Design a protein around this nucleic acid. Structure first.
Ligand SMILES: [Mg+2]
Ligand SMILES: [Mg+2]
Ligand SMILES: [Mg+2]
Ligand SMILES: [Mg+2]
Ligand SMILES: [Mg+2]
Ligand SMILES: [Mg+2]
Ligand SMILES: [Mg+2]
Ligand SMILES: [Mg+2]
Ligand SMILES: [Mg+2]
Ligand SMILES: [Mg+2]
Ligand SMILES: [Mg+2]
Ligand SMILES: [Mg+2]
Ligand SMILES: [Mg+2]
Ligand SMILES: [Mg+2]
Ligand SMILES: [Mg+2]
Ligand SMILES: [Mg+2]
Ligand SMILES: [Mg+2]
Ligand SMILES: [Mg+2]
Lengths: 151, 51, 117
RNA sequence: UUGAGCCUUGAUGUGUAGGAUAGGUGGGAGGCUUUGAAGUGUGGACGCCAGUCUGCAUGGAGCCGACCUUGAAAUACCACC
RNA sequence: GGGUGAUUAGCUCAGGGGAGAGCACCUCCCUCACAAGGAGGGGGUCGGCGGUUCGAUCCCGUCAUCACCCACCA
RNA sequence: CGCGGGGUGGAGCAGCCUGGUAGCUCGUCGGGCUCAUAACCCGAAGGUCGUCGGUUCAAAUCCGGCCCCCGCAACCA
RNA sequence: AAAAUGGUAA
RNA sequence: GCGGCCCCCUGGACGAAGACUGACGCUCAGGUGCGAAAGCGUGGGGAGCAAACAGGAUUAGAUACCCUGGUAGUCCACGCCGUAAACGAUGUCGACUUGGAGGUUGUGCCCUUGAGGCGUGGCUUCCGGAGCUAACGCGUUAAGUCGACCGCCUGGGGAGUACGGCCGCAAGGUUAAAACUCAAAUGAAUUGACGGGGGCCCGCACAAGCGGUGGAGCAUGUGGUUUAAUUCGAUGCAACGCG
């Protein structure tokens, strides 16, 4: 980072649906290098979501993300010897990266029986934009709005 | 300072301030400078202004 | 009320705060607003964004007088100054003149001693 | 000049079931109309923005009203306010 | 004893169809640490009793309490 | 000699009418931060309530003795 | 924003 | 030391040409005068600023730096004080010794044939030659080569202090020692190291992330304590599942 601007590592798409975005999602959910366990959880959650709201696996999942993608965030700058919180726009790829991360943390905290059930409920609430992950996005937007003076 | 702008306008044109005192005088007339500080800042100002 | 239809906007920009006062053409005030009074007290009120928000509020609270035109008189330095003028233009006012009235002594009274921070 | 007023007249009046800017109560089953109603702008005010009390103007012979509702039912007219 | 006024979150105070502010407590970030900031969660029969309309913190009388003026004060 | 006020953790001070569960600064102890020490941060421990005797189911708190300390008064000759 | 100190000889 | 504009009184410097006096000159102990700011006395004045002082912060503390106020003073008239890094840290006068680039102010001639060409004075700034200098540097405005006169110095501390004299309203100024004590104190420059100095660059250094330790039980090492012995060594990073 100091010197060498670097490239990007490619990931293969999801076997069931052939989408890169969903493949990244299982990676975020994976723990201890157990991809088969992770993909099993995600597929079960997606199927439950699809039959809950009709719609379809990818479209329902995308709708949930759109309600959690951030648009601006604060970042300490410390230029003149004082600490500020300057809002900054979010890069398009970093948007869903934060969205997917936030959803997983919300699901992990949610107290249901199975992880698939936790995940299905969490991003189902996200589709109706009332879950904890949605609350996280609102706080980030609200904090950035307050510090709009700096730019 | 004084600009009597005509009806075609989208730019402030506030450029006579930099052509005038504007903030140079304000920045220097806000704290007293004991006579000998000026003389010294004047002397070094153009001691450096040599090529 | 009284439909003056044109006045003057006085911008008092300093290093710590900015005050916007809209008067008629005889110096009778009609309305005012300040960066400090628009929230964001402290270090956030000496910013250009602080100044334009104050200008927008001062544009409000005088709409009853139906101002259409106004000169702007700018006083002092500060992070505001230019930001307010843009906000007044964006607020829907026909700016006619732009003059600065910053007081410049012909070196009269002695200023305070230099800060030794 | 300004209020306190003072003694008269015009307006004044949103949860909610509803045509809704239902102020309470009664005489109360009919009115004003050239002592201008209808179709339109006008401005103070307001508002949980329903448009209203309001000045006149092209205008020139009509509808309200019980009815569906509401805890309340006609400001149809009059009156104790 | 008569008159004048009052009782509303832990605190300081607003308000015939809506209990409102500000300060407190816990969290969130924030900060070197803080601090200073911004964001959420709360926390009241609106003192009780009784009284009209549909209720009416709003309206009325009685209590318990507080403040002042006055009577009382032999 | 007479009259008042005090005695509470290691130090200086609150808790008295309100007899039914000793708190607050600095100190002390353990762990952090530092090359190390101060400062700073986190977490703990520390109390015959001067002594003795009573009335109370219960006494730092209410009463009456004793010890110590502080402050007033001790005048007319 | 704040930021003190470092026993004797060798 | 002296900055708005105008008037009144007044000192010095420089240039052109000519006339005049005829060594009338240079330096100067003692002496006399002038001498920033602060300060003192008497009488005025007082906007701003601001010692002292008061409050708010910061801090371990903060008799400070920062913030809010604020008296003397800063201003005027007269009198005193007589000191400054009063510095060019370089006494005054005179003569001589290669150059370059500028500023300011006079003056002669040539077609001014625009802001030009050729000369000749005064003051002033920078860079550099020989020479000088411990070096740094100075260098026709010398710290170069010489002459005249004056002032001053003789290791550091004690000490520009004590005592005495003179001066002052005071504050104090000026002249100016000794005992005692040390073997150094000091100037310029060189190489490093360091800086809460500057520039450029790099590192799981930060930032972006993931998973841990610090809490529990147990394994293991160390410190401490204990013991007859608890063998010896390793001790910030770079000792502590180490020999
Ligand atoms: Mg200031
Ligand atoms: Mg002499
Ligand atoms: Mg003086
Ligand atoms: Mg004086
Ligand atoms: Mg005086
Ligand atoms: Mg000050
Ligand atoms: Mg001297
Ligand atoms: Mg000098
Ligand atoms: Mg000298
Ligand atoms: Mg030279
Ligand atoms: Mg002396
Ligand atoms: Mg003497
Ligand atoms: Mg990191
Ligand atoms: Mg452990
Ligand atoms: Mg061993
Ligand atoms: Mg050893
Ligand atoms: Mg060894
Ligand atoms: Mg190892």
């Amino acid at each position: 980072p100091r010197r060498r601007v670097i490239g990007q590592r490619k990931i293969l798409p999801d076997p069931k649906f052939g989408s890169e975005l969903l493949a990244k999602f299982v990676n975020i959910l994976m723990v201890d290098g157990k991809k088969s366990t992770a993909e099993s959880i995600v597929y079960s959650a997606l199927e439950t979501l699809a039959q809950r709201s009709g719609k379809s696996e990818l479209e329902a999942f995308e709708v949930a993300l759109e309600n959690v993608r951030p648009t601006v965030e604060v970042k300490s700058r410390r230029v003149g010897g004082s600490t500020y919180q300057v809002p900054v726009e979010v890069r398009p790829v970093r948007r869903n990266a934060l969205a997917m991360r936030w959803i997983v943390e919300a699901a992990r905290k949610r107290g249901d029986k199975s992880m698939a059930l936790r995940l299905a409920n969490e991003l189902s609430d996200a589709a109706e934009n009332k879950g904890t992950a949605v609350k996280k996005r609102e706080d980030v937007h609200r904090m950035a709005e307050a510090n709009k003076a700096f730019a | 300072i004084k600009v009597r702008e005509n009806e075609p306008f989208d730019v402030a044109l506030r450029r006579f301030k930099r052509s005038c005192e504007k903030a140079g005088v304000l920045a220097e007339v806000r704290r007293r400078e004991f006579y000998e500080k000026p003389t010294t800042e004047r002397k070094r100002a153009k001691a450096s202004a040599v090529k | 009320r009284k439909q003056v239809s044109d006045g003057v906007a006085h911008i008092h920009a300093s290093f710590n705060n900015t005050i916007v006062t809209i008067t008629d053409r005889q110096g009778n005030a009609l309305g005012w607003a300040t960066a400090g009074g628009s929230g964001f007290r402290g270090s956030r009120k000496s910013t250009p964004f602080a100044a334009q928000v104050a200008a927008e509020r001062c544009a409000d609270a005088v709409k009853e007088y139906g101002i259409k035109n106004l000169e702007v008189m700018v006083k002092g330095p500060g992070p505001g100054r230019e930001s307010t003028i843009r906000a007044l233009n964006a607020a829907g006012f026909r700016i006619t003149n732009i003059t600065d009235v910053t007081p410049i002594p012909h070196n009269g009274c002695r200023p305070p001693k230099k800060r030794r921070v």
